[PDB]
Design a protein around this ligand. Sequence first.
Ligand SMILES: Nc1ncnc2c1ncn2[C@@H]1O[C@H](COP(=O)(O)OP(=O)(O)OP(=O)(O)O)[C@@H](O)[C@H]1O
Ligand SMILES: Nc1ncnc2c1ncn2[C@@H]1O[C@H](COP(=O)(O)OP(=O)(O)OP(=O)(O)O)[C@@H](O)[C@H]1O
Ligand SMILES: Nc1ncnc2c1ncn2[C@@H]1O[C@H](COP(=O)(O)OP(=O)(O)OP(=O)(O)O)[C@@H](O)[C@H]1O
Ligand SMILES: [Mg+2]
Ligand SMILES: [Mg+2]
Ligand SMILES: [Mg+2]
Lengths: 523, 523, 523
Amino acid sequence: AAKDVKFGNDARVKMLRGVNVLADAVKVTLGPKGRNVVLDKSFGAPTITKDGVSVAREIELEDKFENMGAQMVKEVASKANDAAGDGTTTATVLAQAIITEGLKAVAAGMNPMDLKRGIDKAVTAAVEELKALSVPCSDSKAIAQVGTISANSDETVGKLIAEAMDKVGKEGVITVEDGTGLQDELDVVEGMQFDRGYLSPYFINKPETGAVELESPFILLADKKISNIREMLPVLEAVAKAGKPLLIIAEDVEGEALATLVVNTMRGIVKVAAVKAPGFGDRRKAMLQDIATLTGGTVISEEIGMELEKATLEDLGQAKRVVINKDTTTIIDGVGEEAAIQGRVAQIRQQIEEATSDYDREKLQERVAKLAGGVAVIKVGAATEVEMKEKKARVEAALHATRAAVEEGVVAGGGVALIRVASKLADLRGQNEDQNVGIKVALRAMEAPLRQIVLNCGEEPSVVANTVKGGDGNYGYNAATEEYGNMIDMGILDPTKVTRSALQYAASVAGLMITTECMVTDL
Amino acid sequence: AAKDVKFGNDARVKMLRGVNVLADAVKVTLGPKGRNVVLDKSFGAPTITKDGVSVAREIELEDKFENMGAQMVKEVASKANDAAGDGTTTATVLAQAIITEGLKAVAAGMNPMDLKRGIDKAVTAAVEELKALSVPCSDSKAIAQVGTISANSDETVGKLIAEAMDKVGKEGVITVEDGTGLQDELDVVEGMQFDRGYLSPYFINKPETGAVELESPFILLADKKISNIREMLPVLEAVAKAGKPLLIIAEDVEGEALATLVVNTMRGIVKVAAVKAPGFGDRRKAMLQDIATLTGGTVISEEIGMELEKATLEDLGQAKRVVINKDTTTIIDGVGEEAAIQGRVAQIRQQIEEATSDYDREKLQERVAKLAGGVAVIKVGAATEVEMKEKKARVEAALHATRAAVEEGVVAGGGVALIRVASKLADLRGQNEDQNVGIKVALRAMEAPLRQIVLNCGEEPSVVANTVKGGDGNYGYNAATEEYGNMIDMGILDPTKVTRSALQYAASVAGLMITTECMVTDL
Amino acid sequence: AAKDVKFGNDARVKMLRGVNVLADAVKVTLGPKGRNVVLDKSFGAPTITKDGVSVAREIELEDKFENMGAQMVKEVASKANDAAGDGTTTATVLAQAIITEGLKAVAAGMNPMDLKRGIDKAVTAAVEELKALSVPCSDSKAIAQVGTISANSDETVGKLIAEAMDKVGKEGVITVEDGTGLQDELDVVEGMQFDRGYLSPYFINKPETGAVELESPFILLADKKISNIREMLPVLEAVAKAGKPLLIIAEDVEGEALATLVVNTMRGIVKVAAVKAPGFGDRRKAMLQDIATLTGGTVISEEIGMELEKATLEDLGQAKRVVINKDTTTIIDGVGEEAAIQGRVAQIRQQIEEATSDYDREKLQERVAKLAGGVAVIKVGAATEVEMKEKKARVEAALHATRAAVEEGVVAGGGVALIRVASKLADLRGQNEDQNVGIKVALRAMEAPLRQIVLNCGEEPSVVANTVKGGDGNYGYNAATEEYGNMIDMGILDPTKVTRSALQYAASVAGLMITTECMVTDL
Ligand SMILES: Nc1ncnc2c1ncn2[C@@H]1O[C@H](COP(=O)(O)OP(=O)(O)OP(=O)(O)O)[C@@H](O)[C@H]1O
Ligand SMILES: Nc1ncnc2c1ncn2[C@@H]1O[C@H](COP(=O)(O)OP(=O)(O)OP(=O)(O)O)[C@@H](O)[C@H]1O
Ligand SMILES: Nc1ncnc2c1ncn2[C@@H]1O[C@H](COP(=O)(O)OP(=O)(O)OP(=O)(O)O)[C@@H](O)[C@H]1O
Ligand SMILES: [Mg+2]
Ligand SMILES: [Mg+2]
Ligand SMILES: [Mg+2]
C-alpha cells in the first residue's frame, strides 16, 4: 505494498529539508578551516578523514521523503566523483544552491520546466566559457600544487603525483599502491610500453575499468612468433606455479600460441595474457627484442629468426607488474636491471643517429620513448593501516584531477573560476521570464563554492565575494593565508575537468528534483 | 543501516567523557599506593591483577559515542603494549592529558590541525631529547631493579630476568614458561645457538613471531650433509612417534634431505625443521659437531667425512626445547649433559690457544660463545593456576622492557625523565600561536605520569612536581619511600624504549581524536 | 519553599538564553525593517505593540531562570524607555551584545569584576566622547527631522513640535490635545502657570501621565491656611456641582493643618486639586489676585478674613480648563475678562521696573512671566480613537526626544556616532587585561546596533559596518536609501540624550547580570 501518495507542495519541502541536512553536513567539511569528518565504525576507533564523500556515505534520514531528497542529491557527489575523482563537495554545494533557489521559485508560482531550461542554458554557456578561460598545466611544481589543492591540503601527495608525471609523463603509466612502508613514495620502475591490447577480451582481470593486471608475472618473449605448444610448455609450467601470471609477448599474438593461452587460463592453470610484438613487419621483431632486454630474458629474436623454442626459461623475464589495457601493454619494472635497460636505451639512441632517413629516425625514437618512457608508482604512506588506506584515496583522486589538468589545463581555484564565468553571463537571457529566473538561479549558485570556503574560514562571505567580483582575471581570495592575490601565482588551481563536472552534475540532479508534481512511497 | 549524524561540539564532549572514564579507571591503578584491579569472571572468583591492561580490557560504555572515545584511546595502551610490553598505563595518562587540553583548545576556537602539528613537533623533539638523556644498562642488580619497576613492584621477577640475561646475555635466548611449580625459577639449559634460519618458511610453528618452536624434539645431526632418504629413515621414524618434533642439523640444509622434510611434515608425519651446520666450508663441519656433542648423539662428523648414514639412532640427540627464528637455531638444554657440554667447551677453548693466527682464533671463539652462551629459562611462579598465569605475564613484560633497556639504556623512572625533557623544551615554538599552544599542551601532559604516581601515593601532585622540577638531572621522587633523591642511585629506572613508545602512541591517538568535524553512527 | 540551588555556571547560560530570546524579538522590530508584533488582550482584539517596548512586555519565558534573565533585560529597556522616551530597542540590542560577550568572558573565567569595571570605564569615556561629538541642535528643520524620526516618521509631527516649541518657548509649556482631527492646530491658550504641585497624589485624575486635568474647574482662593477639611467642605460641595472639579489655591498650609487635611482628604474622595499661591509673602498674595483676575473669580484672603467656607461656589471663579503637573500648575482660558487681566499685567510690569533690586526684579519678572506666558496647546488629529491615541503617544515621544535633543544637540543616527566613539575608545585601555577585555566588549557592543539595522535591511552588516567605519566624520548608512550619504545631510539624527541613555542603561544592567556566583531558584 500500500502506498502513501501526496501531492503538491508537501513533496518539495520534504526534499529540500533532506538535501539541506546532507549538504550542510558535507559543506563544512569543505574549507580548510574545518578539518576532517568522522565516520563511526562498528568496531574500534572512528575513521577520520576529510572527505566530503566520507560524510555523504553516512547520511540517511528517518523521514522517508527527506531521506529521498538526501539520497537524490547524494547522486551528484557520486557521479562527479566517478567522472573526475574530486570536487564532490563543490558539486554538493552547487546543487544545494540551485535546488534551494529553484524550489523557492517554484513555490512562487514559476514554471518548473522553464526554470530547468534556464538553468540548463546557463550551464551550457558557462561550460563553454569555462573552456575559454582554462589554461594548461606546467612543470612538476604546478602539478604538485594542483594535486595538493585537489587533495585538500595534502601537499605531499601533490608533489608525488607531479614528480611521477614528470618521470613518465602521461604516456607512462602512473599507478598507486599501498605504501611499502609509512611514507609517500614515488619511484619509476621500468615501464616499457608498446601498443597492443590483449588478444582475448576474456583476459580481463579483476580490474573493472577494462584492463588486466598481473603482479610479478613471468614474461615469455616469443620473439619469433610462437609455432608450437612445445616452445610454450617450459614457460607455461613455470607460470603454472601459482601467483605468477604469465605475459606472452610473441611476434604477434598468435593463433596457435594465443589459442593455447585462452584454453589453459580457461582451466585455471597458468593465468595468462598475450600481446603482439609491437608494430608490424620488421620493426616488430626489433621491438619484441626491446621488451626482452627490458624483462631480462633476451630471447633470440624474430629479427634473428630464432623461435619461441629458441626462447627458453632464460628467455622468460619478470616485472613487479604489468598492465594491458586500452593504452597498451605496459611492463612496470623488469628483471632486466636499470644498467641493462638504460644501456638498451643508449643502443637504440644510436640507432636513431644511424638511420638513413627521417622515417627510420621517427620509428626508432618511437621505440626509445616506449622503452624509456617508464612507469611511475605512487605508494600512499602507511602506518597505520587506516591512515594508509585514506592517504591512498587522496593520492588517487589528486592524481586523477592533475591528469585532467595536464590534458586541457586548470582554472583559478578557490571558487573564483565559476565567479568569473558567472559575471561574464550577466546578460544571458532565455525565452521568457521564468527561464530568466532559472538563469539567474544558476549564476547565483556559482558563487556558492567561494562563499562556503570563506565561511569555513570564519570570514564574511559577502565581503570577500564582493571584493573578488570587484577585481577580475585570476584575482581571488587565498583562504589559507587570508590574503587576496593572483590565484595562479599563488598556486591555487583546479583542473577544469573537476570544476566542469561539479557544475554539470549539480545542475543535472537539481533540474530533476525541481519538477515534482506528486510523490508516491510505501506506507 | 540508518545513521545518526552530528556535528559540531556534541562529538567532542562525547569522546572526552569516554576517554575520561577509561583513563580514570586505569590511572589509579598506576602508582603503588593503589593496588590491583579486579576483573570479573563468569565463573568462580574474580581475577586480581595489577594491570592497567586488565582494567582497560573490561571498559565498554553504554553511550555509543562515549564508547567510541574509550575504544579509541584504548588503542594507545594496546599499541604501546605490543611495541614495548610495558608502560600502557603511562601511555594512557599521557593520552588523557593531551586529549583533555587539546579538546579544550579546540573548544576555545583554536585550529585543530595546528594544535596537532604543535603536539607532533614537541613529541619529535622530545624523543630526540629522550635519546640524548638515556643511559645504558648495567649488571644483574640494575637489570633486576629495572625489571621490577617495569613489572610494577615485583622485585622477584626483576631479579630473575636480570640473572637470566647475566647467564646468556642478549645472545642466548631467554624464554618464559609456566613454572614447573610455584616458584620464580631461572635456569640455564644448554642453549647452543648457531646462525641459520629454517630451510623452509613453511616450517613456522605456533609462534606467530615467525619462528618455529619444538618441545623435547629429536635432533638429527647429519654431519655429513644428508645424501639419502635411507640415512634419514631411522631418525624420521623415531620422530614419527608423536610429540617428538625433529630438528635436522645437516652439513647444510639440503636439497635431498630438506625436500624430504618439507614433504613429510607436509603430510603430518614427523613434523620437522631443518638448518645448516653453522658457517660454511670447513668450520661448518667442526660446528655441526659441537651441536652433536651438545645434543648428545655425536655423529661421525662431516669433518671426518662420515655421513648421515654414519649417523644413527645414537646420533640422534634431544633437548627440552629448540627455537629457529630470525636469530638462529637455538637448542635449549641438550641430551648431552653439562659434563659433556662443559667438557666440549674446554676442548674448543684450547683450540683457540692452538690456532696459529688471529683469524682461526676469532672463528674458534665464535664457536665457544655459541655453544657456551646458553639459554635462560624463566618459569613464572605457580599455585594457583590463576596467579601463575598472571606472574608469567609480568615476567614477560618485565623481560621485554629490560631487554630494551639493555640495548640502548634506561632513563630516570617515576616520571622524571619526561619532566626533564619537558623543561628542556620550554623555548620550542611553531609556525603560529595555535601551534605554540599545541606544543605547550604536549609539554604539560609530560608531567601527568609523575603527578598521577604522586596522587596515587596520597601526596600532593603540584608540590612534588614543583620540587622535582626545582632540581635537575636524576633528581626525583621515590614514591615507595616518599623521599626525594637520585632516581638512578635508588634503582628506579625505565627502559627508554617504553617511555618513548608511551609518549608516541599517546600523541598519535590524541592527534587523531583532536579533529572531528562530524560524527556518524548507527541509529 | 524548597529551593533548588545549583552552580551556576549553568545559571549564567540560563540567563543568557533568556536574554537572547527577548533580545531577538526586540532587535528585529527595531528599525523600519522591523516587523509588526502584537500584544494579546484578554478581551477584544489584540492591541498593536508595535514598538519594541511593548514587545518586551509580552515576552515571558516559561523557564524561571530564563524568564528571570528575560525580565532583567526588559528592565534595561524600561529604564531607558522612561528616561530616554526613545531608543528602548537600541538599548536592548546593546545590552544583549554586551551580556553575551561578557558571559563568554565569564566562560573565559576572566574575573568578571574587571570586565564589569572595564565596561563601565569604556561607557564613561564613550559618554564624554559622545557629548563632544554631539552638536547642539537648534533648527526648525532640525526639529522637524528629529520629530519625523521619532514618529518613524512624521514630518508633520515634528512640525507641530517645532511650531509649539517656538510659540511656547522652552519655558512655554506644550500640551497635546486631540483636535477635531485630523488637523494639526497650534493655539496658545491664555493663562498663568505657577511652579507648584497637587497636595495629595491621590488627586490624580484621568490622565495616566501623573497629572490632573480639570474642565471648567471652580477656583477657590484662600489667603488663609486651611485648618481642616470641614472648612473646605462647603466650598467643595458648591464647587462640585455640577460635575465640576474644584481647584483650591491658598497661600500655604501649616504642617499641622496639612496633616489633618491630608488624612481627611486621603480618606475621603473628592475631586479637587489645590496649589499653593505662587510666590511667598505679599507677592504670593498679589499673585493669587492675578489668578483671580484671570479666573474672573475673586480672591479670598485670610487677611481679608473672608473664610473659604464663607466663600461660596459663586465666589469662586471658574476656569475653562486647568492642568496640574508636578513641575507646574496651569490655568487656561480663565473666565475673567482680558481687559482686567491686561491692566493687572501692566501694573505688574511697572512693578518690575519699580524694584530697584535685582532680587526684587527677578521676583517681579517671575511673576509677570508666569501670568504672561500662558500655555500653548498642540492638537493632534482626532479619530479614530484608537488611531488618535497611537498618534498622540508618538507625538509625545517625538517631543521628548526633540526637547532633549535640542538642548544637548543631536548626533547622527544610524549608530554611526556609537561606532565613531568606539574607535577613539579603543585606544583607551583598562587597568588590567580583563578590564581591557571588558572595554573591548563595550566597544564591540556599540558597533552591533548599526549591524542590526543593516541585518534588518538584509544587507550584510559586515560590509556596511566596515564601510561605515572607514568613513570618518558623519558617515553612515541610510536604511531607506540603502545608499551611503551624510547622516546629517540625510537628516537622520538620533538624539544625544536618547543614545546616551540607552548605552548607559544597557551597560549597567549587563554588569549586574554578568557575575552570578550561584543562582538559587525555587524548586
Ligand atoms: N587549502 C585550500 N585553500 C583554499 N582553497 C582550497 C584548498 N583546498 C582546496 N581548495 C578549493 O576548494 C575547492 C574543492 O576542493 P576540495 O578537494 O577541497 O573539496 P572537494 O573536492 O569539493 O571535496 P572532496 O575532495 O571531498 O570531493 C576547489 O575550488 C579548491 O581550489
Ligand atoms: N615501586 C615503584 N615506585 C615508583 N615508581 C614506580 C614503581 N613501579 C613502577 N613505577 C613507575 O611507574 C611506571 C611503570 O609502572 P606500571 O608498570 O605500573 O605502569 P604501566 O607499565 O604504565 O602499567 P602497565 O604495566 O599495566 O602497563 C614507570 O614510569 C615506573 O618508573
Ligand atoms: N533610514 C534610516 N537609516 C538609518 N537608521 C535609521 C533609519 N530609520 C531609522 N533609523 C534608526 O532606527 C532608530 C530609531 O527607530 P526606533 O525608534 O524604532 O528605534 P528604537 O528607538 O531603538 O526602538 P523603539 O523606539 O521601539 O524603542 C535610530 O537609531 C535611527 O537612527
Ligand atoms: Mg576534492
Ligand atoms: Mg607496566
Ligand atoms: Mg524609538
